[PDB]
Amino acid sequence: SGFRKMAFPSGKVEGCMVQVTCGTTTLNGLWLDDVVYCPRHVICTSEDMLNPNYEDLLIRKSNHNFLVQAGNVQLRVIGHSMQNCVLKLKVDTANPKTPKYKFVRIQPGQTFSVLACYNGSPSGVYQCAMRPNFTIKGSFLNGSCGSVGFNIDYDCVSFCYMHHMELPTGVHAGTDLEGNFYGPFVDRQTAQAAGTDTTITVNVLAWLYAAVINGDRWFLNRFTTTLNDFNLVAMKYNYEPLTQDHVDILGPLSAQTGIAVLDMCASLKELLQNGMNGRTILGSALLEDEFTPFDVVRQCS
Amino acid sequence: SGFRKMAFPSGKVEGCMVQVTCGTTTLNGLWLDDVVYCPRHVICTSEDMLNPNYEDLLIRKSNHNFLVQAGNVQLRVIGHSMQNCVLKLKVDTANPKTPKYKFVRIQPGQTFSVLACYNGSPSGVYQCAMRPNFTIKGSFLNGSCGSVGFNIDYDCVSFCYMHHMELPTGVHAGTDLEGNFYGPFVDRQTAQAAGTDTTITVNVLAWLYAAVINGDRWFLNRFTTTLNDFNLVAMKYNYEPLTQDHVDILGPLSAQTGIAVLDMCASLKELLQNGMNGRTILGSALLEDEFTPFDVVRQCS
Ligand SMILES: FC(F)(F)c1ccc2[nH]c([C@H]3CCNC3)nc2c1
Ligand code: NA
């Protein structure tokens, strides 16, 4: 029994974190085979970031400008190239700890584990969800840039995130490992802001299922509803629309507990309308939306 | 910015999890040097759980009755000795992945990371606190016994918890790595129940300080309280007595934010009386008690 926000074991990814220093600025890099991946804004000074030409700034730099440290060992940069907003540093030595891995781009609403680091040193891991507004509510201090998010499926680490910046709201923005930003953001010191967030409905339902599995059943009721009526509710309460795919994805949970998705949607409907009436669900007074249906199934099986 | 329940990077513990089989029972073990540590109830059969005589069951076991499997490699057991409620199996091969480690018994209120494991294979990592009633609110399915809790202070892993069982209220009980249970629990399947839980007051206060540090001040007020008046009120909300030790421990967070400990105590007193009137603190709708003063300082600073 029990339900916790739960991250993938971070060992496979810890063995890929390196320190990358360029000039005064120093952040984290991901070392895979013989390449170190890190944010391209490592090559910028405070004035550069105001309006950077990265192609122009990068051609000025050369291999020797990048100090790359893998713990106490130094790594020698033999090549540097840019892909989108990540900088790729060719090193002389391949990482003997390279795991089986893929670069994947995730969808808003999907979850991943973040290995937050400082000076190429892993310090903590936590579970995140890519918000619908393409930010993540992480925990990052100065020095975290280049920290990565990932999922593990079988033996394979799926790298999906690299931390680039904090936004003025205190949330965070980054790219996939191919350097494509998540969300309408640019690696530049300008006025950037998170758009209005919404709640990940399928995830809230999944967590209500996780609640029922764990013995929290007070919010269940005799009613059922339809996608159309519910999405009217969802839209009213700043929840993402529920699609037919979401309902399919929630299939296993609806069978394992006997609560149909539209049946559970009636529960969430009443929760959205009348509130929680002083009670909690899985120890929370908020409707938790950072658990995917897969997350619920994997932790409850 | 951001405040998340952050676990420690689990890689150093992952390299220690093995599978221990005895008869038909398989659970997890911790492989450090040439010793595998696991719950002694692995040697219990169906008819044993009520009143097992562990010395009697163990005197009957040979070394080859213990199957220890480290990944695909089978470890050969060369001895076995029971220490309190943990079995210590001598294996012929030292763990090459053995980190810097030490065994510490923790006090209620302390936090640690849990690496949930099944079949000697790590499943997830999450952060926990030792509740005042000496249970923890974990996430454990059948097969996770021998999963361990730990902190990592400067590359040294301090093992502090081994999972042994789940009490009927859905919470969990275990031992330190010397096999001494936390709280009045025994590794017998007779009815035993956790004491009434309370809220870890010193932790809530640290987390309130964390909220000020991340720029949230709405819950402060102009009042103070004596220590004793605070405790007279907090007892009535099922909060842990706050001691001078707790007040001293918060001293650095008081000085960092400019708010005297007893002033923050007045704030909490009012929070308990008012609720939150629809606001949140660091994103939760309840007062969080699973961040320690040490945790707050290490995640914020
Ligand atoms: F938005 C963004 F791209 F993430 C960003 C914004 C400001 C930055 N300042 C720097 C270094 C040089 C001066 N301080 C560190 N890197 C930055 C990156
Ligand atoms: Na219903």
Side-chain angles (χ1 to χ4, degrees):
Chain A
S1 295
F3 205 65
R4 281 264 181 186
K5 197 103 64 183
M6 190 169 302
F8 283 103
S10 60
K12 297 204 155 141
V13 176
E14 282 163 61
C16 310
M17 302 302 325
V18 295
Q19 191 183 47
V20 174
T21 304
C22 189
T24 56
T25 203
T26 165
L27 44 68
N28 313 270
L30 188 69
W31 182 24
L32 293 176
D33 302 302
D34 59 351
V35 177
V36 172
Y37 299 86
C38 78
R40 69 176 183 180
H41 67 65
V42 73
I43 65 177
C44 302
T45 73
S46 271
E47 41 209 344
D48 292 326
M49 296 282 336
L50 273 207
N51 201 305
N53 183 319
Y54 285 96
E55 188 212 353
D56 176 51
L57 299 173
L58 188 60
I59 196 43
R60 309 207 296 118
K61 288 254 163 232
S62 39
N63 290 337
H64 52 76
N65 279 143
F66 303 98
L67 312 173
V68 174
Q69 296 219 266
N72 271 289
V73 174
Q74 186 111 324
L75 295 182
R76 173 201 317 320
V77 176
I78 56 197
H80 50 265
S81 66
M82 207 177 56
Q83 184 186 0
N84 297 317
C85 304
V86 301
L87 182 176
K88 291 158 67 174
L89 296 171
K90 204 78 181 182
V91 292
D92 62 21
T93 314
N95 189 357
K97 295 158 163 323
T98 295
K100 211 222 172 103
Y101 77 88
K102 295 173 289 133
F103 286 168
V104 317
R105 186 168 176 93
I106 59 178
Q107 303 263 90
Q110 284 164 22
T111 55
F112 58 99
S113 308
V114 175
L115 186 59
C117 326
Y118 295 99
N119 305 295
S121 211
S123 48
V125 61
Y126 59 81
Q127 194 68 1
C128 282
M130 176 69 56
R131 304 303 312 171
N133 70 356
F134 285 112
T135 66
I136 76 170
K137 303 206 92 283
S139 177
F140 293 119
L141 294 177
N142 287 161
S144 61
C145 289
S147 296
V148 299
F150 62 95
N151 290 284
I152 302 188
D153 46 281
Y154 204 102
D155 40 338
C156 188
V157 177
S158 286
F159 292 104
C160 66
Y161 179 87
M162 190 185 274
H163 183 60
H164 284 64
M165 74 189 65
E166 173 181 295
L167 292 177
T169 37
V171 308
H172 313 92
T175 68
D176 55 28
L177 266 291
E178 287 176 353
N180 305 292
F181 254 96
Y182 285 103
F185 306 110
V186 303
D187 42 3
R188 158 146 75 260
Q189 183 42 48
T190 54
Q192 301 195 77
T196 319
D197 209 8
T198 52
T199 301
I200 311 148
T201 315
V202 62
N203 284 10
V204 180
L205 294 170
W207 170 83
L208 294 179
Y209 278 107
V212 171
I213 292 163
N214 277 255
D216 254 324
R217 301 179 64 103
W218 63 261
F219 50 86
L220 299 171
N221 61 28
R222 63 160 55 240
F223 309 107
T224 207
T225 194
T226 60
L227 216 49
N228 275 201
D229 292 291
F230 178 67
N231 280 313
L232 294 160
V233 189
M235 182 166 201
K236 190 167 145 153
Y237 290 98
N238 246 33
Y239 268 53
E240 284 293 84
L242 199 40
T243 67
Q244 180 54 46
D245 198 45
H246 293 159
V247 167
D248 300 350
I249 273 149
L250 291 166
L253 294 174
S254 174
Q256 172 184 341
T257 61
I259 291 66
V261 180
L262 291 170
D263 182 359
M264 187 74 89
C265 290
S267 283
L268 180 56
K269 219 189 64 43
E270 297 322 301
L271 278 183
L272 287 175
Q273 276 158 24
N274 329 313
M276 276 207 213
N277 295 128
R279 277 169 281 172
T280 58
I281 293 163
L282 286 175
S284 203
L286 291 201
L287 298 172
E288 178 67 44
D289 76 335
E290 300 217 355
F291 289 101
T292 76
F294 161 99
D295 289 350
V296 169
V297 165
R298 166 146 146 71
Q299 198 180 147
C300 304
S301 302
Chain B
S1 186
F3 211 66
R4 277 224 181 260
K5 233 182 245 183
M6 195 150 111
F8 281 98
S10 59
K12 289 165 164 92
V13 179
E14 292 168 52
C16 299
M17 313 291 334
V18 300
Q19 176 168 233
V20 182
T21 306
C22 194
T24 66
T25 302
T26 286
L27 44 65
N28 315 271
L30 184 69
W31 183 23
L32 295 172
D33 295 325
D34 47 10
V35 189
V36 172
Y37 304 78
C38 74
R40 69 186 182 174
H41 67 71
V42 71
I43 76 184
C44 287
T45 81
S46 278
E47 298 301 294
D48 277 304
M49 293 82 108
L50 283 173
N51 287 293
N53 191 314
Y54 282 104
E55 302 68 23
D56 201 49
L57 302 166
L58 193 58
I59 195 58
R60 301 176 189 261
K61 288 247 153 23
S62 279
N63 294 323
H64 53 277
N65 301 132
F66 295 116
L67 289 216
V68 181
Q69 195 177 321
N72 265 356
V73 182
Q74 201 201 123
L75 299 185
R76 158 137 155 271
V77 171
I78 43 149
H80 58 267
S81 84
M82 167 168 71
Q83 173 179 17
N84 298 301
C85 302
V86 302
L87 212 41
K88 298 191 308 209
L89 308 182
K90 273 301 163 133
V91 300
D92 58 352
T93 299
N95 187 2
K97 295 187 200 149
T98 295
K100 265 278 154 213
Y101 75 93
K102 77 206 218 223
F103 293 165
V104 308
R105 184 171 176 92
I106 59 167
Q107 303 296 326
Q110 185 59 265
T111 60
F112 56 95
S113 299
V114 168
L115 188 62
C117 294
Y118 300 88
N119 317 295
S121 161
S123 166
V125 63
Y126 58 85
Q127 188 77 355
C128 261
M130 180 55 56
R131 306 304 308 168
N133 69 358
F134 290 98
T135 66
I136 68 162
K137 290 164 95 133
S139 172
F140 290 111
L141 305 181
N142 289 144
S144 60
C145 301
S147 294
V148 296
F150 59 98
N151 289 287
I152 310 202
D153 312 278
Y154 308 88
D155 217 47
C156 176
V157 183
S158 43
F159 293 98
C160 66
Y161 177 89
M162 170 154 290
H163 184 48
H164 277 247
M165 69 206 221
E166 163 166 307
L167 298 158
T169 36
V171 309
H172 310 95
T175 69
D176 55 45
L177 271 294
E178 302 205 281
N180 299 302
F181 260 92
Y182 288 100
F185 305 118
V186 289
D187 49 2
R188 280 168 67 195
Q189 261 165 195
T190 66
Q192 54 188 311
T196 64
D197 200 25
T198 59
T199 308
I200 307 151
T201 314
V202 67
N203 278 9
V204 170
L205 289 174
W207 169 85
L208 286 178
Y209 274 113
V212 174
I213 278 151
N214 285 224
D216 203 346
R217 291 185 55 120
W218 72 258
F219 44 82
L220 306 178
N221 64 21
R222 50 168 213 124
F223 299 126
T224 201
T225 178
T226 65
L227 187 48
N228 192 51
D229 286 341
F230 172 76
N231 284 320
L232 289 170
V233 185
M235 269 51 149
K236 301 168 182 191
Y237 297 96
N238 257 11
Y239 267 59
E240 272 302 278
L242 194 80
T243 72
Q244 190 56 45
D245 283 28
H246 294 153
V247 169
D248 300 321
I249 288 152
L250 291 163
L253 289 163
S254 166
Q256 197 204 316
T257 53
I259 317 190
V261 180
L262 293 170
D263 284 350
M264 198 49 99
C265 283
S267 184
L268 175 52
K269 260 166 73 183
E270 191 178 73
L271 273 170
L272 293 174
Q273 141 192 302
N274 294 351
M276 287 198 344
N277 303 117
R279 290 160 289 190
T280 61
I281 301 176
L282 293 169
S284 33
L286 300 214
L287 301 167
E288 172 73 45
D289 70 350
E290 296 217 341
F291 290 98
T292 69
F294 201 94
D295 297 345
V296 167
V297 173
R298 95 162 299 251
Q299 177 171 174
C300 304
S301 294

PDB file of all heavy atoms in Angstrom, chain B residues 9 64 101 136 146 160 177 179 202 210 229 233 285 299:
ATOM      1  N   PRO B   9      20.072  11.067  -4.984  1.00  0.00           N
ATOM      2  CA  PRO B   9      20.415  10.202  -6.118  1.00  0.00           C
ATOM      3  C   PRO B   9      20.680   8.791  -5.612  1.00  0.00           C
ATOM      4  O   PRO B   9      21.416   8.589  -4.650  1.00  0.00           O
ATOM      5  CB  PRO B   9      21.670  10.859  -6.695  1.00  0.00           C
ATOM      6  CG  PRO B   9      21.593  12.306  -6.230  1.00  0.00           C
ATOM      7  CD  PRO B   9      20.995  12.208  -4.852  1.00  0.00           C
ATOM      8  N   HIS B  64      23.637 -23.095   1.994  1.00  0.00           N
ATOM      9  CA  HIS B  64      23.109 -23.241   0.638  1.00  0.00           C
ATOM     10  C   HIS B  64      21.596 -23.158   0.594  1.00  0.00           C
ATOM     11  O   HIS B  64      21.020 -23.267  -0.497  1.00  0.00           O
ATOM     12  CB  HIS B  64      23.533 -24.564   0.004  1.00  0.00           C
ATOM     13  CG  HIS B  64      23.215 -25.750   0.846  1.00  0.00           C
ATOM     14  ND1 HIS B  64      24.034 -26.178   1.870  1.00  0.00           N
ATOM     15  CD2 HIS B  64      22.137 -26.571   0.849  1.00  0.00           C
ATOM     16  CE1 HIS B  64      23.496 -27.245   2.438  1.00  0.00           C
ATOM     17  NE2 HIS B  64      22.337 -27.493   1.849  1.00  0.00           N
ATOM     18  N   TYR B 101      29.950   4.079   3.214  1.00  0.00           N
ATOM     19  CA  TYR B 101      28.700   3.979   3.933  1.00  0.00           C
ATOM     20  C   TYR B 101      28.935   3.944   5.426  1.00  0.00           C
ATOM     21  O   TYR B 101      30.061   3.826   5.911  1.00  0.00           O
ATOM     22  CB  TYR B 101      27.899   2.760   3.502  1.00  0.00           C
ATOM     23  CG  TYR B 101      28.406   1.449   4.022  1.00  0.00           C
ATOM     24  CD1 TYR B 101      27.922   0.911   5.200  1.00  0.00           C
ATOM     25  CD2 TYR B 101      29.376   0.747   3.333  1.00  0.00           C
ATOM     26  CE1 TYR B 101      28.387  -0.306   5.674  1.00  0.00           C
ATOM     27  CE2 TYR B 101      29.840  -0.480   3.788  1.00  0.00           C
ATOM     28  CZ  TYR B 101      29.347  -0.999   4.963  1.00  0.00           C
ATOM     29  OH  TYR B 101      29.818  -2.209   5.413  1.00  0.00           O
ATOM     30  N   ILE B 136       6.550   4.774   8.903  1.00  0.00           N
ATOM     31  CA  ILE B 136       6.727   5.698   7.796  1.00  0.00           C
ATOM     32  C   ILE B 136       5.600   5.489   6.799  1.00  0.00           C
ATOM     33  O   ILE B 136       4.990   4.421   6.730  1.00  0.00           O
ATOM     34  CB  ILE B 136       8.085   5.550   7.106  1.00  0.00           C
ATOM     35  CG1 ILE B 136       8.162   4.212   6.386  1.00  0.00           C
ATOM     36  CG2 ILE B 136       9.213   5.742   8.118  1.00  0.00           C
ATOM     37  CD1 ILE B 136       9.248   4.161   5.353  1.00  0.00           C
ATOM     38  N   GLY B 146      13.090  -5.523   2.669  1.00  0.00           N
ATOM     39  CA  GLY B 146      14.514  -5.392   2.461  1.00  0.00           C
ATOM     40  C   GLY B 146      14.930  -4.186   1.648  1.00  0.00           C
ATOM     41  O   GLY B 146      16.138  -3.955   1.503  1.00  0.00           O
ATOM     42  N   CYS B 160      19.765   3.962   7.052  1.00  0.00           N
ATOM     43  CA  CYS B 160      19.030   4.182   8.268  1.00  0.00           C
ATOM     44  C   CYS B 160      17.743   3.378   8.396  1.00  0.00           C
ATOM     45  O   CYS B 160      17.156   3.366   9.486  1.00  0.00           O
ATOM     46  CB  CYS B 160      18.727   5.678   8.408  1.00  0.00           C
ATOM     47  SG  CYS B 160      17.606   6.354   7.175  1.00  0.00           S
ATOM     48  N   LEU B 177      19.814  -0.661  10.254  1.00  0.00           N
ATOM     49  CA  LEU B 177      20.611  -1.716   9.652  1.00  0.00           C
ATOM     50  C   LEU B 177      21.309  -2.558  10.693  1.00  0.00           C
ATOM     51  O   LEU B 177      22.095  -3.431  10.337  1.00  0.00           O
ATOM     52  CB  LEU B 177      21.628  -1.138   8.673  1.00  0.00           C
ATOM     53  CG  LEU B 177      21.136  -0.977   7.241  1.00  0.00           C
ATOM     54  CD1 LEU B 177      20.873  -2.301   6.624  1.00  0.00           C
ATOM     55  CD2 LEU B 177      19.864  -0.176   7.221  1.00  0.00           C
ATOM     56  N   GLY B 179      19.171  -4.061  12.666  1.00  0.00           N
ATOM     57  CA  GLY B 179      18.034  -4.912  12.920  1.00  0.00           C
ATOM     58  C   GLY B 179      17.168  -4.504  14.082  1.00  0.00           C
ATOM     59  O   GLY B 179      16.265  -5.259  14.438  1.00  0.00           O
ATOM     60  N   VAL B 202       8.591  20.790  14.320  1.00  0.00           N
ATOM     61  CA  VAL B 202       9.817  21.461  13.900  1.00  0.00           C
ATOM     62  C   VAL B 202       9.958  21.427  12.382  1.00  0.00           C
ATOM     63  O   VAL B 202      10.504  22.358  11.775  1.00  0.00           O
ATOM     64  CB  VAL B 202      11.030  20.836  14.607  1.00  0.00           C
ATOM     65  CG1 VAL B 202      11.246  19.416  14.131  1.00  0.00           C
ATOM     66  CG2 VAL B 202      12.269  21.669  14.335  1.00  0.00           C
ATOM     67  N   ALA B 210      11.148  27.989   4.806  1.00  0.00           N
ATOM     68  CA  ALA B 210      11.442  27.803   3.389  1.00  0.00           C
ATOM     69  C   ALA B 210      10.502  28.636   2.526  1.00  0.00           C
ATOM     70  O   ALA B 210      10.904  29.166   1.480  1.00  0.00           O
ATOM     71  CB  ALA B 210      11.338  26.323   3.014  1.00  0.00           C
ATOM     72  N   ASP B 229       2.925  28.436  25.544  1.00  0.00           N
ATOM     73  CA  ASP B 229       1.615  28.698  24.956  1.00  0.00           C
ATOM     74  C   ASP B 229       1.521  28.085  23.568  1.00  0.00           C
ATOM     75  O   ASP B 229       0.477  27.536  23.193  1.00  0.00           O
ATOM     76  CB  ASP B 229       1.326  30.202  24.893  1.00  0.00           C
ATOM     77  CG  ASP B 229       1.007  30.796  26.260  1.00  0.00           C
ATOM     78  OD1 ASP B 229       0.655  30.035  27.208  1.00  0.00           O
ATOM     79  OD2 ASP B 229       1.099  32.042  26.375  1.00  0.00           O
ATOM     80  N   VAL B 233      -1.294  25.112  22.475  1.00  0.00           N
ATOM     81  CA  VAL B 233      -2.174  25.165  21.310  1.00  0.00           C
ATOM     82  C   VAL B 233      -1.851  24.045  20.320  1.00  0.00           C
ATOM     83  O   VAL B 233      -2.756  23.455  19.719  1.00  0.00           O
ATOM     84  CB  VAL B 233      -2.088  26.534  20.622  1.00  0.00           C
ATOM     85  CG1 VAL B 233      -3.107  26.605  19.496  1.00  0.00           C
ATOM     86  CG2 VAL B 233      -2.303  27.648  21.611  1.00  0.00           C
ATOM     87  N   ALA B 285      -1.748  22.661  -0.125  1.00  0.00           N
ATOM     88  CA  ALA B 285      -2.926  23.140   0.575  1.00  0.00           C
ATOM     89  C   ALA B 285      -2.955  22.700   2.025  1.00  0.00           C
ATOM     90  O   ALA B 285      -3.899  23.049   2.748  1.00  0.00           O
ATOM     91  CB  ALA B 285      -4.191  22.655  -0.134  1.00  0.00           C
ATOM     92  N   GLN B 299      18.208  22.567   0.337  1.00  0.00           N
ATOM     93  CA  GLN B 299      17.537  22.761  -0.943  1.00  0.00           C
ATOM     94  C   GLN B 299      17.424  24.239  -1.321  1.00  0.00           C
ATOM     95  O   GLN B 299      17.299  24.543  -2.515  1.00  0.00           O
ATOM     96  CB  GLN B 299      16.144  22.086  -0.940  1.00  0.00           C
ATOM     97  CG  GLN B 299      15.324  22.291  -2.239  1.00  0.00           C
ATOM     98  CD  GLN B 299      14.035  21.448  -2.333  1.00  0.00           C
ATOM     99  OE1 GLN B 299      13.237  21.609  -3.264  1.00  0.00           O
ATOM    100  NE2 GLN B 299      13.836  20.544  -1.375  1.00  0.00           N
TER     101      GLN B 299
END
